[PDB]
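ping. complex inputs:
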Amino acid sequence: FDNSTYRNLQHHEYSTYTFLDLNVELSKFRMPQPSSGRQSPRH
Amino acid sequence: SNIVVSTRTGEVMRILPRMHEDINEEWISDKTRFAYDGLKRQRLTQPMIRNEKGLLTYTTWEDALSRVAGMLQSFQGNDVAAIAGGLVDAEALVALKDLLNRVDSDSLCTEEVFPTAGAGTDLRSNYLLNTTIAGVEEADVILLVGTNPRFEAPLFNARIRKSWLHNDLKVALIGSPVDLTYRYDHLGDSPKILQDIASGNHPFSQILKEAKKPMVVLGSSALQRSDGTA
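pong. complex structure:
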């Protein structure tokens, strides 16, 4: 067993759009959103 | 709109609103508030006649009134006529009506045309806002025909927006797609659509049918286009 090595080394290879790319990837797993009934409160 | 005129030493200083819950209730339009200075310019202050050269020259009340009286005694019947403007009051209107009735004249007309066919001014409900400005807050569907209430009646449009905000009021417009500061349904600008809504083809006929408190408002400006009777 090992309790001495830092294994959170992946945060050294995160680019500008990594968060947004992960969001685009996750978009397919999401459930459909609810609806208030209007396009916007200004409608 | 009910207003308060602030005057100092015989001069009009400013215009302020006056709370009247049924009409404007705290507000006035910009023309109401900021056009009082036009009362200090281009003012007619003395009676005027035409001299031998054809120009307008000052004269006394007696001379001008005598000239007008002579011309009014010369002619009678259809040859005497009157046209009333936009800022005339009921006292002056009834006085002028009586004066021309004395010479047997009925040619007493305004500048804004209204369809005289049918009832035609005989019934007072034929040319009025019967629902009233306050009643807008009770309606659920409103149709506006050939009008731009934002500029023709700013406080009426403010009441419409207040109802649209708080009562989820539905608004439709037949005419030009102007900006009313609130979102509405544009059904087109051709007057033919009206007959369609009367025929029942247009879905807004069904919307008005389902409406609990429907409201149909026709702009008096739309009656000036020589087909206002139709």
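The radius of gyration of chain B is 23 Å.
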